[PDB]
Amino acid sequence: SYQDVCRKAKEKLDKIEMDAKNYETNLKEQANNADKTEEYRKKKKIAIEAFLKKIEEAADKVAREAKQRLDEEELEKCKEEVEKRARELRRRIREILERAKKWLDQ
């Protein structure tokens, strides 16, 4: 049903968002203290970008599949809600990357 599809897509996006927040918390807590050379910063930035781009692939897949299922009344309200949730997740993922680059450039 459109109700189950909506609820499940939102639940999956919430899980991806929490995984991104937990990853960010783990960066600040578990990362080791070494000489922050230009090379160290570039190596860490490319890995963080790769990790966050893979989180974005998961969010994109959940959103595209939810929209596709809702396409095949209140169904339009659900599509708007899932798309708004996908956009906000994308902005949050972008804000994590920006804070991480600022954190490495300290």
Residue numbers in the entry: 5 to 76, 86 to 119
Quote from the publication.
The most effective growth-inhibitory antibody from this panel, R5.016, bound to an epitope which overlapped that of 9AD4. We previously determined the structure of the R5.016 bound to PfRH5 and find that 13/15 of the residues on PfRH5 contacted by R5.016 are retained in our epitope mimic designs. R5.016 bound with lower affinity to RH5-34EM than PfRH5, although still in the nanomolar range (115 nM vs 2.4 nM). We next determined crystal structures of the RH5-34EM epitope mimic bound to scFv fragments of human monoclonal antibodies R5.016 (at 1.63 Å resolution) and R5.034 (at 1.75 Å resolution). Comparison of these structures with those of PfRH5 bound to R5.016 and R5.034 showed significant similarity, both in the fold of the epitope mimic and in the interactions that it makes with antibodies. Of the 15 interactions formed between PfRH5 and R5.016, 13 were retained with the epitope mimic. In the case of R5.034, of the 10 interactions made with PfRH5, 9 were also observed with the epitope mimic. These structural alignments also confirmed that RH5-34EM more correctly recapitulates the epitope for R5.034 than that for R5.016, with R5.034 binding closer to the centre of the RH5-34EM immunogen, while R5.016 binds more towards the tip of the immunogen, where the structural similarity to PfRH5 starts to diverge. Production of our focused immunogen involved grafting the 9AD4/R5.016/R5.034 epitope onto a small scaffold protein and redesigning the resultant molecule to ensure that it folds correctly. This was successful, with structural studies showing that both R5.016 and R5.034 bind to the synthetic immunogen with the expected binding mode.
